[PDB]
């Protein structure tokens, strides 16, 4: 049976057919110690996709091969007993179980200390069990039959919670994601594999770059793999050039990575330094007024960079102030400059986050219960989007259960769902917004809220939220009244970003509204409660729909001249034909 | 034939090939006495998994083969049967019954007084009767078919209380963890099993401390078995190393174990003694001022130690005073010293209460309570952290019924649950906190608050809480205003902490603030309404904001001279990079 | 739909206010049983006749009430959901929709309780136009309890027609009675 249903990895490994494993020496040492145990001799690797599971198993073979194992294990050998033997080559219920018994008996015979391994224990047990190895295997545990289990933590948890027995037969070994630098070392170990595979030379800077990029381009997959994937892709691109050479940091790899989604200048040019020294000036141009809010945000974001602030915590803010103040524009513009995607952010509508708090909760419905979008609202999105702003809209209405989770992620951001998996997105800036202190911004005590008044704003916060929450937010930020002092030019800022996307620039407007329509829109648009929100609405109707009404006359060649044709707003701005 | 899927334990015992069992002589005698009974003669050990429930049964087998068994039972043999017997061979509805009935009949039919046993009794009755090999037995109890086996107290209640008939068929026998010395004797008994299996010699003292370590280290694990985990794992450690001699006193064990939580040396040190002696002296370096509070703690701790306090319970304090005075800081720092880990603290929100509190406190329950984490907030943390500090946040806000619930910590360390399980605290020091007397501390009568102020505080305490509650407290401790003298050191603590917690050693700072920058920090970071708390935020706002940004701007490559320069707080940092 | 007359001033005010781009939501403040409905029917015809400021040229009138909060409701919070559902549908593109509420007494929620009422200040200055109506006996209490209502709505003083106005109405509706009854 073994010749059909299992692979003698140790012997293959002895011959070659192995990738030298590095950065997992402790996992191997742990595995060896477990296998050596008089009792409870079975280890299990628990990690995530891209972590190094198969390598850990091969690393064990390397120690076996060199007999760099305790006396007990010097006769040990590894066999891959999974997937193909279970379902890919199977047709009916029981095919696996009978084959399994078959190999266990071949294995049980004393053909050296056979140590088996499972690449995916989810394939065993699964759903309904039916003794899919799970009862027979431990039933025969006296006959050596040592085995190394393995799984993602997500499944480990689900499998364990359904069972709880193998959990106490198998020693847990958690396998951590390696540092980017460790990832690079892995890439270096595999450098010649890629060079041979593709026939291209790889520069050391290329390896460094790929690992760094992996952190920055494949947010849902762990670093060894994410980096190795890009390197193989990049090398293949170079091989194509070779076939019609070498692998280089930005010339091949960065662009290859960029080309997986777009990107062409981002990540490559993103040295961060000048965004702070000059990148901050951009938010204050995209968002107008509230310069200190911008600075506060910029500062804290930057503090999370380089782990200067303890890296366990992402920047985190509480945005208090007027609606229509730009508090979310800032969140988006930050995502824009910081990540190059204003819509990468995840919006959390907290006004709906009442007693339901299930699929509607970041953590999701406790796994296994009806309503199986288990973290579909936010966790799953975060797996794909850990490099963006998470924002809580009217967080003051969020159910305490949600607020609790926020606290859990607010610091020590090991974001973990009810699925049993961790996202750990310490790079996700989180913004909570609130109208809680609005009663004090409404005091009008400076368009820029002055001392005491801002303290009353913070006061309201102290009264509503638990101190622990408040003690972990990196800053409370106030979205100061925009006033004429801002909107007199915001209107231009808005009209300009519209121009730039108005007709994809095939045709464009001048729209010189002088002072007259600029003030018309600003004065009738801007609200001291709703801020610029109604202003934007006026632009859509006063200008964009109006311009459309004129273009439908089919009389334009290009540009757009202005003549503001003079109850509230009876003028309607009106630009001339 | 019953042998098809089950084991003759007595015969195994006749052949040896089974660890000898010691330290449970009374349990097995009790078991035997029960078995010898005319009526209601079945036993069932009750405890925790890993407790030795099997070993106790095995000890009985030894008694049979040694004829220490009464003559009515000398004609008996023990036979195990479970899980594989139940499910490996069960494919269709009714297979359970057929497999059991088959066995039961073979036994019933003259062939030896076999005492059948189930080590996982809750499997009988499945998840809710429907004769999941359940009714079957009472019906067959008329054939004697004597049964032993075991249950945890949790599953016991979960199943047995529902079964009812069990209670009139079995005479349950409770079991419990042995002492450490007894465990060591067990370890000595098993010592050669490892010395032979691993080849690793075990120092006598190694066995001794392994058991000690099991309690000092392996939170929720059973002393029985866990102590062996330490022995076997430690031996495996040595075995791997020697082939790449022995297990030494505490050294190899402790490093092998301690590494699982860290704190290596702290665990590998003096058995409290010196820590207890220089508790306050050393604590004063992390907790500044409040010497009396520190002394109070040191004393209670010392009393919880060495059995000086009544061993039936944990020590506790009521920490009264202003937030920011260090009530929690102290509690965390002592969690630090006590458990070598400040994160051990269990934080409890006392204000989140109503008369419907239930799962909200410990594991209390109501109809509809089910949801798995039915109050693990307090109890699972204690389960997982039995060597810890638990703290009540503004205990004055606790509902009186909850203050009563807290009685389970205040005395009588036994802790109940509506899940049918207990926690039973011991080395779980509890701190209750409150601002109940804040208006008296605000008298500011010295940096060492005068007694009449304290009397006002104690008055309020007595007025507010039931005397019964208060009486159980080891000490009620009142915190002083910290003032300049305390923050004079607190700042330095935090400054050092920040670089030490700066990932590793990435920049190093001189932190040479001199009195002036320390005063700056005090001026804008210490407040009588938040005490020293704002110092943290201020340091973030000044030191991290200004220096981190310069680092991030690549202005600060390495090192850093640190101070301030003379609206407000323009003085923040103002340093060359 | 019956013709309405004697309300041209009340209707014109309603139209001017709806046309108004800031405090654009009118409310028929006054004596109950005076044809407040008729004013709305008036508006419903002003649109179509389009004898309105061109602001309302793209507009449409609907009467959103009762079914809106109760008939389509099953449990707590449905007032917000049913209203929100509609508001989303009409927030953009599909004409300059104006809703009429028979009673503003259904606004300010069931003791506010975010019962559609939350959508009110949210939409009060978010297009989503609405015409209210009220009995003065409580109107005064609506504005004292709400505050925002007075700040967000334009009261229109409305009252019963004189006898002469009434007979004009009756004559206008004369054929409606004659036709129905024969
Ligand atoms: N030489 C090596 N050093 C470290 N890791 C390696 C090495 N060679 C292969 N690997 C990794 O083992 C991993 C495959 O296991 P893993 O992704 O963790 O499995 P799964 O998807 O099932 O969780 C890949 O990332 C693979 O590149
Ligand atoms: N420079 C700017 N450009 C465009 N909008 C700005 C700018 N500064 C502030 N704002 C305004 O902030 C408004 C959005 O405010 P916000 O409260 O976050 O949104 P919402 O009210 O839609 O929830 C936008 O309409 C935007 O015009
Ligand atoms: N000499 C001994 N004396 C007491 N207990 C022993 C001895 N030898 C082995 N054991 C016990 O074997 C037990 C295993 O625990 P047990 O509760 O029976 O669970 P399991 O079903 O996992 O074996 C341990 O408690 C261990 O102490
Ligand atoms: N004596 C002290 N030594 C060091 N830090 C202190 C001391 N007293 C107060 N603090 C500060 O106050 C904070 C905790 O305050 P505390 O009163 O114990 O709790 P809380 O204010 O969070 O209710 C700590 O972060 C700590 O920096
Ligand atoms: N001239 C009119 N002809 C017909 N109806 C009129 C006239 N003037 C006012 N009305 C009516 O006043 C009515 C108010 O409706 P009604 O059903 O009586 O409820 P309410 O008790 O709120 O007033 C409207 O239907 C409106 O048409």
Swiss-Prot record, chain C:
ATP 1 binds at residues 30-37. Changing residue 2 to A/D/F/N/L/Q/S: Confers resistance to prion-curing by guanidine. The modification Phosphoserine is found at residues 24, 124. Changing residue 2 to K/W/Y: Impairs prion propagation. Induction: By heat stress dependent on the heat shock transcription factor HSF1 and the general stress transcription factors MSN2 and MSN4. Expressed at a higher level in respiring cells than in fermenting cells. Expressed in stationary phase cells and spores (at protein level). Residues 1-182 are annotated as: NBD1. It is found in: Cytoplasm; Nucleus. Required, in concert with Hsp40 (YDJ1) and Hsp70 (SSA1) and small Hsps (HSP26), for the dissociation, resolubilization and refolding of aggregates of damaged proteins after heat or other environmental stresses. Extracts proteins from aggregates by unfolding and threading them in an ATP-dependent process through the axial channel of the protein hexamer, after which they can be refolded by components of the Hsp70/Hsp40 chaperone system. Substrate binding is ATP-dependent, and release of bound polypeptide is triggered by ATP hydrolysis. Has 2 AAA ATPase type nucleotide-binding domains (NBDs) per monomer, a low-affinity, high-turnover site (NBD1) and a high-affinity site (NBD2) with a 300-fold slower rate of hydrolysis. There is allosteric regulation between the 2 sites. ATP binding to NBD1 triggers binding of polypeptides and stimulates ATP hydrolysis at NBD2. Nucleotide binding to NBD2 is crucial for oligomerization. The C-terminal extension is involved in oligomerization. Homohexamer, forming a ring with a central pore. The hexamer is stabilized by high protein concentrations and by ADP or ATP. Oligomerization influences ATP hydrolysis activity at NBD2. Interacts with YDJ1. Interacts (via C-terminal DDLD tetrapeptide) with CNS1, CPR7 and STI1 (via TPR repeats); under respiratory growth conditions. Present with 32800 molecules/cell in log phase SD medium. Belongs to the ClpA/ClpB family. This is Heat shock protein 104.
């Amino acid at each position: 049976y073994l010749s059909k249903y299992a692979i003698d990895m140790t012997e293959q490994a002895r011959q070659g057919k192995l990738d030298p494993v590095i950065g997992r020496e402790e996992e191997i040492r742990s595995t060896i110690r477990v296998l050596a145990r008089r009792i409870k001799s079975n280890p299990c690797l628990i990690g995530e996709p891209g972590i190094g599971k198969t390598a850990i198993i091969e690393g064990v073979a390397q120690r076996i091969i060199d007999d760099d194992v305790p006396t007990i294990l010097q006769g040990a050998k590894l066999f891959s007993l999974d997937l193909a033997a279970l379902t890919a080559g199977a047709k009916y219920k029981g095919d696996f179980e009978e084959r399994f018994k078959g190999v266990l008996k071949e294995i049980e015979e004393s053909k050296t200390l056979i140590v088996l391994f499972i690449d995916e224990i989810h394939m065993l047990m699964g759903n309904g069990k039916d003794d899919a190895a799970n009862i027979l295997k431990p039933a025969l545990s006296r006959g050596q039959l040592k085995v190394i289990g393995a799984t993602t933590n997500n499944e480990y948890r689900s499998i364990v919670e359904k069972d709880g027995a193998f959990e106490r037969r198998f020693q847990k070994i958690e396998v951590a994601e390696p540092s980017v630098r460790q990832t690079v070392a892995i890439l270096r170990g595999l450098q010649p594999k890629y060079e041979i595979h593709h026939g291209v030379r790889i520069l050391d800077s290329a390896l460094v770059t790929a690992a760094q990029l992996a952190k920055r381009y494949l947010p849902y997959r762990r670093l060894p793999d994410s980096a190795l994937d890009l390197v193989d892709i990049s090398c293949a691109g170079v091989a194509v050039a070779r076939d019609s050479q070498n692998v280089v940091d930005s010339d091949t790899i960065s662009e290859t990575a960029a080309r997986l989604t777009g990107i062409p200048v981002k990540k490559l040019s993103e040295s961060e330094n000048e965004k702070l020294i000059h990148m901050e000036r951009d938010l204050s141009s995209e968002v107008v007024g509230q310069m200190d809010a911008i600075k506060a945000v910029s500062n804290a974001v930057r503090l999370s960079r380089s782990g200067l602030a303890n890296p366990r915590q992402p920047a985190s803010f509480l945005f208090l102030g007027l609606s229509g103040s730009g508090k979310t524009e800032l969140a988006k513009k930050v995502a824009g400059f910081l990540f190059n995607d204003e819509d990468m952010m995840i919006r959390v509508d907290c006004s709906e986050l009442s007693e339901k708090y299930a699929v509607s909760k970041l953590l999701g419905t406790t796994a296994g219960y009806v309503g199986y979008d288990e973290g579909g609202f936010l966790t799953n999105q975060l797996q794909y989007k850990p490099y963006s702003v998470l924002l809580f809209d009217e967080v003051e209405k969020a159910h305490p259960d949600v607020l609790t989770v926020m606290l859990q992620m607010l610091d020590d951001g090991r974001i973990t769902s009810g699925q049993g998996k961790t996202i750990d997105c310490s790079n996700c800036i989180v913004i909570m917004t609130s109208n809680l202190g609005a009663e004090f911004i409404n005091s009008q005590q400076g368009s820029k809220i002055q001392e005491s008044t801002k303290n009353l704003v913070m006061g309201a916060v102290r009264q509503h939220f638990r101190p622990e929450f408040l003690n972990r937010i990196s800053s409370i930020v106030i979205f100061n009244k925009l006033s004429r002092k801002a909107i007199h030019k915001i209107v231009d800022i808005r009209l300009k970003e519209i121009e730039e996307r108005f007709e994809q620039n095939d045709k464009h407007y001048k729209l010189n509204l002088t002072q007259e329509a600029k003030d018309f829109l600003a004065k009738y648009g801007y609200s001291d409660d709703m801020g610029a929100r109604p202003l934007n609405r006026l632009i859509q109707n006063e200008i964009l729909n109006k311009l459309a009404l004129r273009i439908l006359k089919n009389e334009i060649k290009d540009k757009e001249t202005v003549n503001v044709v003079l109850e509230a707003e009876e003028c309607l701005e009106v630009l001339p034909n």
